[PDB]
Amino acid sequence: QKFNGLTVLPPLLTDEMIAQYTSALLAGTITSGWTFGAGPALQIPFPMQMAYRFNGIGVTQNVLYENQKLIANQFNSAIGKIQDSLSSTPSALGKLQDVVNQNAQALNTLVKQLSSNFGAISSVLNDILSRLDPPEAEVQIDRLITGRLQSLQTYVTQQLIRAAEIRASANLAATKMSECVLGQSKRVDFCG
Amino acid sequence: PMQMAYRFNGIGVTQNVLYENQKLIANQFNSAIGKIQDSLSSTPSALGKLQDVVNQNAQALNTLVKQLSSNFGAISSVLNDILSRLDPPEAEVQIDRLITGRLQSLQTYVTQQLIRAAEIRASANLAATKMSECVLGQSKRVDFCGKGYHLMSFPQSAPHGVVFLHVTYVPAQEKNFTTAPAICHDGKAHFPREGVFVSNGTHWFVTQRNFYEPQIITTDNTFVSGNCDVVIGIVNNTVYDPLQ
Amino acid sequence: TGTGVLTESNKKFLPFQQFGRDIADTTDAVRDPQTLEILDITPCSFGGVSVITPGTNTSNQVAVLYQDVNCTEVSNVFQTRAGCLIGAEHVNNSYECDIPIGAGICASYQTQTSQSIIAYTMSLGAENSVAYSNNSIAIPTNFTISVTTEILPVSMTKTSVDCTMYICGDSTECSNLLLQYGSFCTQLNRALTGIAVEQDKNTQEVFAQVKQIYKTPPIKDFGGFNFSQILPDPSKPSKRSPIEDLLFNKVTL
Amino acid sequence: LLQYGSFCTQLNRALTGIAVEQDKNTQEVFAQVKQIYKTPPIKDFGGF
Numbered sequence: 001q002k003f004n005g006l007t008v009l010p011p012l013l014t015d016e017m018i019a020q021y022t023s024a025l026l027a028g029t030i031t032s033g034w035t036f037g038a039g040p041a042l043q044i045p046f047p048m049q050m051a052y053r054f055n056g057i058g059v060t061q062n063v064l065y066e067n068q069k070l071i072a073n074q075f076n077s078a079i080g081k082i083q084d085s086l087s088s089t090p091s092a093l094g095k096l097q098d099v100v101n102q103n104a105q106a107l108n109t110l111v112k113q114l115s116s117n118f119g120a121i122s123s124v125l126n127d128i129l130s131r132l133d134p135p136e137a138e139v140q141i142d143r144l145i146t147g148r149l150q151s152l153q154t155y156v157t158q159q160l161i162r163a164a165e166i167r168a169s170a171n172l173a174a175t176k177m178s179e180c181v182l183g184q185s186k187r188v189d190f191c192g
Numbered sequence: 193p194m195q196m197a198y199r200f201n202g203i204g205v206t207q208n209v210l211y212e213n214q215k216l217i218a219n220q221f222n223s224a225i226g227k228i229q230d231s232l233s234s235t236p237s238a239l240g241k242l243q244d245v246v247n248q249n250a251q252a253l254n255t256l257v258k259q260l261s262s263n264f265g266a267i268s269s270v271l272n273d274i275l276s277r278l279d280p281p282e283a284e285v286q287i288d289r290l291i292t293g294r295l296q297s298l299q300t301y302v303t304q305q306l307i308r309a310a311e312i313r314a315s316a317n318l319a320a321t322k323m324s325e326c327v328l329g330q331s332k333r334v335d336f337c338g339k340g341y342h343l344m345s346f347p348q349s350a351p352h353g354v355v356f357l358h359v360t361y362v363p364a365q366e367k368n369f370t371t372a373p374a375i376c377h378d379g380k381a382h383f384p385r386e387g388v389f390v391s392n393g394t395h396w397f398v399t400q401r402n403f404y405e406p407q408i409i410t411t412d413n414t415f416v417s418g419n420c421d422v423v424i425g426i427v428n429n430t431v432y433d434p435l436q
Numbered sequence: 437t438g439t440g441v442l443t444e445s446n447k448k449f450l451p452f453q454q455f456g457r458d459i460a461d462t463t464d465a466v467r468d469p470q471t472l473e474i475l476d477i478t479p480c481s482f483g484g485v486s487v488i489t490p491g492t493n494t495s496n497q498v499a500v501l502y503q504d505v506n507c508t509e510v511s512n513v514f515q516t517r518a519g520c521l522i523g524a525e526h527v528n529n530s531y532e533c534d535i536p537i538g539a540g541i542c543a544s545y546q547t548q549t550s551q552s553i554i555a556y557t558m559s560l561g562a563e564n565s566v567a568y569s570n571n572s573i574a575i576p577t578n579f580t581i582s583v584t585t586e587i588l589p590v591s592m593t594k595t596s597v598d599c600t601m602y603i604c605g606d607s608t609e610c611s612n613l614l615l616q617y618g619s620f621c622t623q624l625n626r627a628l629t630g631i632a633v634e635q636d637k638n639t640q641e642v643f644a645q646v647k648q649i650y651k652t653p654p655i656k657d658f659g660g661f662n663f664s665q666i667l668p669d670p671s672k673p674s675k676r677s678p679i680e681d682l683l684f685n686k687v688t689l
Numbered sequence: 690l691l692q693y694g695s696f697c698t699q700l701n702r703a704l705t706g707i708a709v710e711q712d713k714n715t716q717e718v719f720a721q722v723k724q725i726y727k728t729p730p731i732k733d734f735g736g737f
């Protein structure tokens with residue numbers, strides 16, 4: 001949709017381009033453990049990497065080797081269950097749907113504020129100008145200007161506050177990427 | 193040197209590494225610190241994050257000041273002249289418009305200052321956490337105190353901020369090696385107590401994970417568990433005990 | 437009344453309605469008198485104008501971006517997915533992003549190959565596959581000790597405004613009128629005082645984390661480790677380190 | 690509207706600040722790899 005004064009700017013990173021970043025992060029993780037987050041990516045066989053991640057939680061690595069078939073089956077089953085889980089449980093993506101809903105609602109309110117009189121004889125500037133002489137049309141227009149400017153300012157303020165919330169979430173997500181994806185976190189319930 | 197050795201021990205490299213190449217490590221640290229001086233003196237926009245707070249506060253104050261030039265519909269913007277040329281019953285209506293405009297301008301300024309203060313408070317809380325966790329300790333928490341494995345960091349005060357010098361260990365020239373997760377001896381299956389098994393092609397060694405140091409595999413750096421029939425990748429090799 | 441472009445529409449109005457209106461109370465179509473045709477209304481094109489510049493310290497050359505317009509309405513014009521961009525030559529080969537245009541497009545002053553502002557799809561980094569095998573590992577045979585600098589703002593200037601003289605100045609006349617607005621300025625003074633007082637708490641919390649002042653020994657026998665670049669210099673009038681002195685000479689107010 | 694001063698250069702500046710910040714959010718979350726890594730054509734990951 002396109003309206004009077006409202007424009008939406010395209011993000012700098014396209015969705016086709018963020019998928020490449022996540023592909024790089026995956027490939028790096030599977031093929032090199034956490035080593036690629038510190039220095040050069042150093043290949044390591046994946047069961048050996050999982051053995052060292054087991055060793056990183058106080059389980060000897062012989063456990064993983066003596067039940068690798070079992071652990072791989074459990075991992076495959078758990079990954080498969082994610083698809084069904086978030087496909088069948090609604091409101092699972094609610095935290096993402098809510099940002100879209102809130103932004104759309106704020107814009108709809110901002111546009112619907114152009115239908116308000118604020119005490120003017122009419123809300124249509126051309127209609128009031130076409131039938132009132134200038135020294136009174138000035139007074140009528142001024143109320144409309146004041147109301148519309150106040151509406152725009154309220155919109156800007158709520159956008160600033162919501163953007164602060166989204167920035168806090170994005171900082172949390174960056175910390176989680178660094179500390180869960182590029183490392184193994186010894187830190188309780190931070191990564192699940 | 194001993195403190196730095198134990199910080200090395202805190203990232204998974206034995207102390208003997210630091211002591212056998214302390215001259216090199218100290219030279220390399222001195223060079224890396226000296227490069228910070230040159231980088232800050234040569235690269236502009238390095239202190240951008242600090243200059244931006246100053247710039248934004250200055251811009252907010254400048255717009256607040258320039259809002260005194262606005263009429264807001266009053267016959268004039270200077271209160272003194274409208275007061276000096278209108279009788280009170282007609283000057284009150286003019287002054288009211290200025291009062292409304294200036295009050296609402298001040299309100300906008302204060303609201304944006306509150307939001308920016310919340311942002312700066314978040315940054316200061318982050319800086320306090322980084323002081324505690326990077327300067328007062330060694331952080332096992334990746335990419336929080338720089339790129340690489342965190343050794344130690346130094347604070348430097350900056351105008352309206354803090355600068356952290358994060359010393360990190362970064363691995364260097366590496367070799368493709370062949371591995372196996374265990375070795376089979378007399379039907380017993382041996383795992384490495386610390387480190388990994390590697391082969392130079394003809395002979396098998398245990399090394400620590402972050403620095404190539406081959407050792408002949410002994411009963412003293414591996415542990416047996418189970419038999420050879422269970423682990424999928426096994427290599428037959430001999431293990432020696434000093435007792436014989 | 438209104439302005440816009442009128443086009444034929446396939447919206448089956450009812451015989452009695454005279455003009456259609458979309459969500460959020462905007463006229464989206466009207467029916468024509470004298471032909472009863474149903475004609476659609478679209479706002480005629482508009483958008484912001486943005487200026488791409490390498491900097492007056494490098495060149496006076498500039499590319500201009502019209503943000504949401506087709507390249508049909510007014511030396512080399514390029515239609516991109518974030519607007520119409522004129523003055524930038526488009527290069528097939530990708531570089532690291534310098535000045536963001538949007539939608540994956542960036543632009544910079546090349547200074548070597550083309551003497552203009554080029555426009556390109558930004559690259560995400562060097563491609564390299566990792567040599568994954570089921571029986572191969574890579575272990576580093578050396579290391580490098582690296583120092584990186586991280587910069588964080590802690591506090592800002594503790595400003596304070598006095599409403600009564602910002603709004604009125606020395607005028608009892610309008611001060612009497614300002615009294616009719618209640619505590620609008622007790623509130624603003626209070627809010628700014630809160631900001632100012634917490635600016636000091638920010639610094640206290642970042643820096644005051646040691647209960648006593650530790651001193652370095654007179655003799656610097658640190659086993660080859662050299663800290664002269666970070667410890668304070670006795671020869672300076674203000675006892676700052678060389679790096680802190682450069683930091684203080686680097687930000688300008 | 691000119692008689693209200695800089696209200697709208699100010700509102701435009703605030704919205705532009707938010708817009709510029711969203712790209713920084715995305716970049717700091719995702720742009721954490723120096724290099725683009727690819728997986729091998731054969732998926733012999735020990736059963737995973």
Ligand SMILES: *[C@@H]1O[C@H](CO)[C@@H](O[C@@H]2O[C@H](CO)[C@@H](O)[C@H](O)[C@H]2NC(C)=O)[C@H](O)[C@H]1NC(C)=O
Nearest residue numbers: 390391392393394395396397398406407408409
């Ligand atoms: C593989 O390891 C063996 C020993 O584990 C190395 O053999 C040594 O070679 C040197 C020749 O420079 C001889 O002086 C030693 O006596 C040998 N050791 C033994 C136990 O025979 C061999 O050089 C290594 N090769 C690689 C490529 O690492």
Ligand SMILES: *[C@@H]1O[C@H](CO)[C@@H](O[C@@H]2O[C@H](CO)[C@@H](O)[C@H](O)[C@H]2NC(C)=O)[C@H](O)[C@H]1NC(C)=O
Nearest residue numbers: 450451452453454467468469470471472473474
């Ligand atoms: C209004 O009047 C005009 C003519 O005065 C009508 O336009 C005619 O429309 C028919 C279509 O059925 C055409 O065949 C004629 O050629 C048109 N006339 C002219 C002069 O263009 C129009 O239909 C009338 N509408 C109403 C609602 O009365």
Ligand SMILES: *[C@@H]1O[C@H](CO)[C@@H](O[C@@H]2O[C@H](CO)[C@@H](O)[C@H](O)[C@H]2NC(C)=O)[C@H](O)[C@H]1NC(C)=O
Nearest residue numbers: 043366367368369565566567568569572574729
């Ligand atoms: C480690 O082994 C891999 C292959 O086993 C090497 O990767 C090759 O790198 C060259 C670049 O000069 C490419 O042309 C080949 O296509 C790569 N091979 C594969 C299978 O991708 C890598 O160079 C080796 N590195 C070391 C240090 O030995």
Ligand SMILES: *[C@@H]1O[C@H](CO)[C@@H](O[C@@H]2O[C@H](CO)[C@@H](O)[C@H](O)[C@H]2NC(C)=O)[C@H](O)[C@H]1NC(C)=O
Nearest residue numbers: 215216219220223364365366577578579580581
């Ligand atoms: C380990 O790294 C250091 C440097 O990081 C290397 O030391 C260099 O050695 C050469 C000798 O050929 C000298 O010319 C350089 O000046 C040295 N550099 C420094 C900073 O002192 C060392 O050779 C590396 N060793 C290995 C095995 O990689």
Ligand SMILES: *[C@@H]1O[C@H](CO)[C@@H](O[C@@H]2O[C@H](CO)[C@@H](O)[C@H](O)[C@H]2NC(C)=O)[C@H](O)[C@H]1NC(C)=O
Nearest residue numbers: 222225226229656657660661662663664665678
């Ligand atoms: C520590 O390092 C600094 C430089 O990194 C050394 O300071 C130099 O001292 C000599 C005096 O002989 C001066 O000529 C240089 O100009 C100084 N350099 C700088 C950058 O100021 C200092 O001598 C070193 N100390 C130790 C013990 O290594």
Ligand SMILES: *[C@@H]1O[C@H](CO)[C@@H](O)[C@H](O)[C@H]1NC(C)=O
Nearest residue numbers: 372424425426569570571733
């Ligand atoms: C590794 O790959 C080779 C080649 O396909 C295969 O023969 C072997 O069984 C695999 N597993 C090992 C060596 O543990």
Ligand SMILES: *[C@@H]1O[C@H](CO)[C@@H](O)[C@H](O)[C@H]1NC(C)=O
Nearest residue numbers: 376378379420426427428429
């Ligand atoms: C290891 O030793 C056993 C003992 O009989 C033998 O069967 C097996 O083939 C050996 N492994 C290899 C790779 O030859």
Ligand SMILES: *[C@@H]1O[C@H](CO)[C@@H](O)[C@H](O)[C@H]1NC(C)=O
Nearest residue numbers: 234235236491492493494495
């Ligand atoms: C242009 O840049 C040079 C070096 O980058 C600098 O010395 C000069 O002052 C700059 N010109 C300005 C700031 O007007």
Ligand SMILES: *[C@@H]1O[C@H](CO)[C@@H](O)[C@H](O)[C@H]1NC(C)=O
Nearest residue numbers: 505506507508509515516517
């Ligand atoms: C720009 O206009 C041309 C024809 O004028 C059209 O073919 C093209 O699709 C337009 N670009 C868009 C809609 O992005």
Ligand SMILES: *[C@@H]1O[C@H](CO)[C@@H](O)[C@H](O)[C@H]1NC(C)=O
Nearest residue numbers: 525526527528529530556557
């Ligand atoms: C750029 O590449 C496209 C496809 O690769 C090609 O059709 C086009 O002619 C190229 N243009 C230039 C200037 O290299």
